[PDB]
Design a protein around this ligand. Structure first.
Ligand SMILES: [Mg+2]
Ligand SMILES: [Zn+2]
Lengths: 255, 265, 150, 74, 76, 220, 66, 233
């Protein structure tokens, strides 16, 4: 996910003044076990930064098994590397060792494939050279226009008396069992009992709490959840007489 | 700001410039319950103070990801607004991240440096020999060279390309409570809030100890995640939760600040 | 019971210790307690006590001692514990609703709502945590020295 | 097909690549699909990445953008 | 020991609060009832005991007054 | 000490890009100063960029014009390549009526007095003999970047298309700090700052605009 | 109690690292801890018999849903 | 020209000499720009005096502590480094300290020549044991930032003359943080908080005024090239 969009200037930038577009976290790589992106990155620098390799009078070792006439390449040279018969390990060590004076008469990236970056934010140089390069990145469909969703109140379902699901109907967000488990593990009876009554079900509850909030009064104590009425009526529909007794005295209806 | 409730309900619909100065006033120390499905443990839900940020993203804290088990690879978290004074209170008292540092499982701190902050603080505190501005202690010919009157002097020396942040150096410390043996030797009777003492550490370890509480003894050891866990556990066992909850925040700040100049690529 | 209470906790811990994660024994012992806390009856009682019936300890002991039965310790599976739970609307919530609810109905079996799980289903104040009578009923008055001072 | 709504909500905008005064062989690329630029599966972009931690904005496999991308519309 | 100037919703400190009640669960209601009271005041009906801020939330007043030790509770 | 006032010699290597040399400076002071200047330049410089375009043919961005090679979207994306310069503080309206067959360049616009387009070699759109492309562009003088303001909320007509306006005349800005004089006998830093513009304003003018800006920001 | 009866730790002790170390330094290779497995509570469990909570860092609360 | 929201400057007091300033609210990326600038200027730019080389009457080659003192040469060095002095010479000013008998050697015990003044006479430099007399010669000079000890054949050919690392900076320790502020419908406006620990000699507002004074003068030459159009405050 895009954690932060930095203003152009506060961005680790090359000695020629080009700000890098993205910074991917290093700790990810050895854990996730996908170094590919780094070789892809490296070769990228070789792809953008054109390379007239001063081959040699007797050819360099890395270019002993050099592919079809791939010794010179102009600026922004688009390269093909198949997924097994592709660019080898040590080849890239030869391919980065390649002169490309980007307007100014100096190389940016070193033999190893790292570059000395100036911090846009701080203003200092980074104390060690960091692995810059060109990477092909993909705009993914998992978008905030799909994912982001909010609801203070809104339009409720007719069948159930708890807020709907989905951004289209302006729904709520699902408070599951596992959340109740955690609420109870905290021991936050009031939060859970607020979530499972006025925030979802109780028709008097929601309007009364909205009214009480907009008036700026004490939140009314949630009394009669719709779920319990539903289950009481539903159990009484299957010919089971269920009556809630007090500690001492006579029994009551909920209303 | 709104003449009538209907007009307010219009103005909030239009999202006019006059609401944004108010939303800070309304959100001022007003907690929200962050929850990720599937909720695998109690720390899978946590209450926070919502800061208002631009963009379309919930800005989670880097320390609560161990608890939530939430990688930033397209994972989404639900926010809830406690309404009742009781819910609002309980959100602030029970399930506030700062309170829930230790695991219900063991009581090991879960809200601790992880992945990045670990490498950051590890680089920060790791003492490596053969570095720039190293304390030599020259023998009869020259001065000792690498001794420092204050951490400030050393920060001034390190801001210049002269002294490296990782080297055996001899600082004179005052604000940091010394090691048990060192207090037991030098002071014995009184402590050391104002009392001065010489260490043989690295500026990074001093800068790290600067984060941990004024009265806490000195580390002088590289911050491996086990050692971090041990120290933060010890601090959690010995000190109040707010102190630990700030020290771990400073540990995060410094951790990330130094995770850059780590040179880990 | 006690050696099994040690054994189960040891065994449950060793496999966590193996995978590197560490939980505190008491969290296992809370579940192992919930395993070893009932008796199976071969044949005894002689008044509303069926032979071959799982029975809760305290309720069994009270009628067993006879101030004015015969039980042996049993180890039950967690599912067989939530099945043979004292509650009915939770037992119904877990599995085999009709079977247990029918029995509950004819038995006229009263649940106390001491369990959290039932008190979740009905939208009522959870008795656990901040829902005990010592908490939910607290009179907070401003102190006599603070009143006059205002 | 100019700005056709594709099944998954994204656009299927096509453009011509070839010039007027130009010869074209059989089985050659003439138009530009939604993800072609001179007939090649181009889904995303080529961006100058730097690999390092940067002040906790990229912690736990998060990504850091240069506003330049949002401004230039890449 | 070294508080290191806490700010906002972590102020007042939770340890100084916890000491007043028997357990945090008591402190929750012990605060929430005072919050319920200062809510009522705006409409016991006792006023804000500690100096109320520019737009301080009922909760924070209660916790500041419990930190000030201006209240007592009764375990039901 | 060294009680020498800092000095800066204005230079040129090209028209679009020039070097600058600031010296003498306090040891380890350069990188920060260079950073401040670079950042002030890249962020806060008053640029002339297209604010809102209006084509009489198309009503919106996601259609096409009869008899153009590329459509109003890619036309709009090409127009971002304009380096228009506007001394006017108010919104100014330019016109382009390129009729008949040929390639339409950035020199083919007819700008009012005090509006200049500095790279007329660039390619906007190609027209066949059948097609005519009639566009009127609105240039406003801002700074940094602004998102394409909506024409629904504001009382603007259906015809006008908002564009991604980039008020940044500066293109590339870097610096490097030379050692200059050994450690002994009072070592000083010299910073050399390479500046590269859009040919809208001269590096000197941009550097002077930054110098003018941040001094207002610094309070004493 | 140790070999002699030099009683080092009394009833209702949290058993922190100092106490645990002290019990080792005393020279006893066993100790009898108060657990949920041996709790004579009518409903659920009683606080003191659970031990100190991990979340709080203090004696377990009289409300806790352990 | 261009207009923005006029930045405020407020002086939060932490202790006697050390303070925090708040500069708010700054446009998206006005925090660090002037922040790190202000830091480096505060640390480097401001004029101040310090000891550069010392000479304690005793050690020619004797690496061990001087006979008849409680401290060690290193402790004396790092103590003396602490001594805060202000000189108006722009010349290596030599000054002598001499004390004898038992007890404490305070900062007041030194005898300063004409021009130089010590602002803390109460601060400790050494503790002298009974039947002993310490006499040390110190070279105070004016400079900028931090200079490491270098024997560049001034103390090189000399038998002794111990070179000492100088803190010319009146400002000892500067740090800073930026915070996003909801100034209007826009967010991510940077509020610069800047922590500044100075010596007793100068005031942090004076140090900041000096730094600002040097920066406006430094950018004055660029300001005064064209004078075309500025984002005026
Ligand atoms: Mg995931
Ligand atoms: Zn018990």
């Amino acid at each position: 996910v895009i954690g932060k969009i930095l203003p152009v200037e506060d961005m680790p930038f090359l000695p020629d003044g080009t700000p890098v577009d993205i910074i991917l976290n290093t700790h990810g790589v050895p854990r996730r076990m996908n170094i590919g992106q780094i070789l892809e990155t490296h070769l990228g620098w070789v792809a953008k930064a054109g390379w007239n390799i001063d081959v040699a009078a007797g050819v360099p070792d890395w270019a002993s098994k050099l592919p079809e006439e791939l010794y010179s390449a102009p600026a922004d040279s688009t390269v093909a590397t198949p997924v097994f018969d592709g660019a080898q390990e040590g080849e890239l060590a030869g391919l980065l060792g390649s002169t490309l004076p980007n307007r100014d008469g100096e190389v940016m990236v070193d033999a190893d494939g790292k570059s000395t970056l100036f911090d846009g934010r701080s203003g200092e140089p980074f104390p060690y050279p960091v692995t810059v390069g060109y990477m092909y990145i993909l705009k993914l469909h998992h978008l905030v226009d799909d994912k982001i969703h909010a609801r203070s109140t809104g339009p409720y379902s007719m069948i159930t008396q708890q807020p709907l699901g989905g951004k289209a109907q302006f729904g709520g967000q699902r408070f599951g069992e596992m959340e109740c488990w955690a609420m109870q593990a905290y021991g936050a009876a009031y939060t859970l009992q607020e979530l499972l009554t006025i925030k979802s079900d109780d028709t008097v509850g929601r309007v009364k709490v909205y009214e009480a909030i907009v008036k700026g009064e004490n939140i009314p104590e949630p009394g009669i959840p719709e779920s319990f009425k539903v289950l009481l009526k539903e159990l009484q529909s299957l010919c089971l007489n269920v009556e809630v007794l007090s500690s001492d005295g006579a029994a009551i209806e909920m209303r | 700001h709104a003449q009538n409730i209907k007009s307010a309900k219009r103005m909030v619909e239009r999202q006019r410039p006059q609401v944004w100065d108010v939303l800070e006033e309304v959100i001022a120390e007003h907690p929200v319950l962050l929850n990720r499905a599937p909720t695998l443990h109690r720390l899978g839900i946590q209450a926070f103070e919502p800061q208002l940020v631009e963009g379309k993203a919930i800005q989670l804290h880097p320390l609560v990801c161990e608890a939530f088990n939430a990688d930033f690879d397209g994972d989404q978290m639900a926010v809830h607004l406690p309404l009742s004074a009781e819910a609002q209170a309980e959100a602030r008292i029970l399930m506030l991240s700062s309170n829930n540092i230790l695991s219900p499982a063991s009581g090991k701190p879960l809200a601790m440096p992880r992945l990045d902050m670990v490498t950051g603080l590890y680089y920060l505190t790791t003492l490596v020999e053969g570095a720039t501005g190293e304390y030599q202690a020259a023998t009869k010919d020259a001065p000792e060279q690498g001794v420092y009157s204050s951490p400030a002097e050393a920060i001034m020396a390190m801001d210049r390309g002269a002294l490296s942040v990782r080297a055996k150096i001899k600082v004179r410390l005052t604000e940091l409570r010394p090691p048990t043996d060192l207090e037991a030797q030098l002071f014995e009777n009184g402590w050391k809030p104002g009392d001065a003492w010489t260490a043989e550490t690295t500026l990074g370890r001093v800068m790290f100890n600067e984060l941990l509480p004024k009265s806490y003894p000195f580390v002088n050891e590289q911050m491996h995640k086990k050692v971090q866990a041990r120290i933060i556990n010890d601090l959690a066992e010995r000190f109040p939760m707010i102190v630990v909850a700030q020290t771990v925040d400073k540990l995060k700040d410094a951790g990330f600040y130094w995770a850059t100049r780590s040179g880990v690529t | 019971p006690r050696e099994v209470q040690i054994h189960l906790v040891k065994e449950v811990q060793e496999v966590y210790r193996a995978q590197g994660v560490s939980i505190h024994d008491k969290h296992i012992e809370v579940i192992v307690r919930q395993m070893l806390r009932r008796v199976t009856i071969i044949d005894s009682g002689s008044t509303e006590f069926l032979p071959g019936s799982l029975t809760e300890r305290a309720e069994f002991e009270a009628e067993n001692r006879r101030v004015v039965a015969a039980g042996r310790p049993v180890l039950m599976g967690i599912t067989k514990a939530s099945l043979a739970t004292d509650s009915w609307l939770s037992a119904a919530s877990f599995q085999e609703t009709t079977r247990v609810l029918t029995d509950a109905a004819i038995n006229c079996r009263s649940d106390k709502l001491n369990g959290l799980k039932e008190n979740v289903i009905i939208g009522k104040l959870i008795p656990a945590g901040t829902g005990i009578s010592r908490y939910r009923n607290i009179q907070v008055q401003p102190t006599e020295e603070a009143r006059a001072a205002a | 097909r100019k700005f056709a709504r594709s099944n998954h909500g994204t656009c299927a905008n096509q453009r011509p690549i070839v010039d007027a005064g130009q010869r074209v062989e059989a089985g050659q690329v003439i138009a530009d699909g939604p993800c072609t630029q001179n007939g090649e599966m181009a889904l995303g972009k080529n961006l100058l990445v730097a690999i390092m931690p940067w002040e906790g904005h990229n912690y736990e496999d998060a990504i850091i953008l240069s506003n330049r991308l949002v401004e230039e519309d890449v | 020991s070294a508080y290191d100037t806490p700010l906002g919703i972590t102020n007042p400190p939770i340890d100084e609060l916890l000491s007043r009640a028997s357990s945090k669960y008591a402190l929750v209601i012990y605060a929430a009832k005072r919050a319920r009271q200062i809510n009522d005041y705006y409409n016991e009906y006792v006023g804000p005991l500690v100096e109320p801020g520019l737009q301080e939330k009922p909760l924070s007043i209660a916790l500041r007054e419990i930190h000030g030790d201006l209240l007592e509770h009764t375990e039901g | 000490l060294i009680s020498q006032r800092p000095t800066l010699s204005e230079e040129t290597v090209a028209e679009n890009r020039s070097r600058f040399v600031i010296e003498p400076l306090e040891p380890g002071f350069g990188y920060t100063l260079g950073n401040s200047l670079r950042r002030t330049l890249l962020s806060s410089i008053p640029g002339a960029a297209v604010t809102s375009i209006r084509i009489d043919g198309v009503l919106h961005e996601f259609t096409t014009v009869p008899g153009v090679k590329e459509d109003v979207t890619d036309i709009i994306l090409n127009l971002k390549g304009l380096v228009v310069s506007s001394d006017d503080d108010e919104p100014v309206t330019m016109y382009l009526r390129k009729q008949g067959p040929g390639v339409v360049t950035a020199g083919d616009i007819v700008p009012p007095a005090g509006v200049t387009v500095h790279n007329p070699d660039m390619h906007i759109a190609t027209l066949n003999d059948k097609g005519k492309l009639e566009v009127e562009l609105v240039v406003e003088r801002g700074r940094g970047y602004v998102p394409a303001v909506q024409n629904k909320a504001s009382g603007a007509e259906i015809g006008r298309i908002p564009v991604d306006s980039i008020y940044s005349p500066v293109l590339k800005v870097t610096y490097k700090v030379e050692a200059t004089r050994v450690e002994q006998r009072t070592d000083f830093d010299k910073l050399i700052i390479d500046v590269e513009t859009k040919n809208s304003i001269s590096p000197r003018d941009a550097l002077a605009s930054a110098g003018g800006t941040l001094v207002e920001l610094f309070g004493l | 109690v140790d070999a002699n009866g030099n009683v080092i730790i009394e009833r209702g002790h949290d058993l922190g690292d100092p106490a645990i170390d002290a019990l080792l330094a005393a020279g006893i290779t066993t100790v009898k801890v108060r657990s949920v497995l041996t709790c004579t509570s009518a409903t659920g469990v009683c606080a003191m018999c659970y031990g100190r909570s991990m979340a709080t860092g203090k004696l377990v609360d009289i409300g806790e849903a352990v």
